[PDB]
Amino acid sequence: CFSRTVLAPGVVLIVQQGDLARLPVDVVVNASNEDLKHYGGLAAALSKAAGPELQADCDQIVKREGRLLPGNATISKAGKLPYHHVIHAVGPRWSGYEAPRCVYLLRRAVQLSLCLAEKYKYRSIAIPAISSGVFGFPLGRCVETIVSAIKENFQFKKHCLKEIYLVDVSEKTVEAFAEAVKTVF
Numbered sequence: 001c002f003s004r005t006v007l008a009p010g011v012v013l014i015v016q017q018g019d020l021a022r023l024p025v026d027v028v029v030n031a032s033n034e035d036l037k038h039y040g041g042l043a044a045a046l047s048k049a050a051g052p053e054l055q056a057d058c059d060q061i062v063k064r065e066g067r068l069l070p071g072n073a074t075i076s077k078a079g080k081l082p083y084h085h086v087i088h089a090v091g092p093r094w095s096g097y098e099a100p101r102c103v104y105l106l107r108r109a110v111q112l113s114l115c116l117a118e119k120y121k122y123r124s125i126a127i128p129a130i131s132s133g134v135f136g137f138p139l140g141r142c143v144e145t146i147v148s149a150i151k152e153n154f155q156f157k158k159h160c161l162k163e164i165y166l167v168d169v170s171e172k173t174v175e176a177f178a179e180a181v182k183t184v185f
């Protein structure tokens with residue numbers, strides 16, 4: 001654990017190193033593409049551990065609801081992962097020509113992820129540095145946008161959610177999260 005920040009009474013933000021495929025939390029957020037096709041990065045690790053259940057429920061979801069748009073999130077079965085569900089958030093693909101829009105869409109992915117958690121009555125959620133890998137979002141802007149989006153969501157005391165974790169395997173990204181929490185709070 002790298003930091004702990006009370007967001008509201010009985011609600012904490014925790015930055016931690018760890019593996020989203022195996023955390024003692026209720027649900028996790030995947031950094032997905034629009035097709036819910038988990039063939040790279042975090043998505044691939046999750047899907048591998050999950051067995052084909054997760055990709056198949058995801059195919060049926062696209063084959064039912066249609067392609068997801070950037071900024072949106074949906075939920076699927078988790079298969080063999082230690083969760084009932086995986087929340088798939090589609091971060092934006094970074095363009096330096098549209099940086100404000102990109103920030104908007106990541107904020108949105110984050111907030112919709114939180115809304116889905118609330119809706120399925122979850123009290124703990126873990127979230128990665130959505131968009132900061134293959135999708136190319138500048139790591140610094142990326143982790144501040146996520147932390148700020150989480151800060152806005154609890155500008156009011158009220159929440160099902162009691163613990164929100166920001167998690168990555170790599171320590172640089174985790175440090176980046178811990179710094180963003182300093183700067184933002």
Ligand SMILES: Nc1ncnc2c1ncn2[C@@H]1O[C@H](COP(=O)(O)OP(=O)(O)OC[C@H]2O[C@H](O)[C@H](O)[C@@H]2O)[C@@H](O)[C@H]1O
Nearest residue numbers: 031032033038039040041042043045130131132133134135
């Ligand atoms: N094998 C891995 N295991 C755990 N974490 C990983 C792994 N690979 C990358 N990560 C971390 O997860 C975070 C998100 O990176 P990506 O998974 O590349 O997410 P985005 O950048 O949101 O990429 C979305 C796209 O990538 C995949 O191809 C996915 O199917 C979609 O097309 C980054 O911190 C990255 O270092």
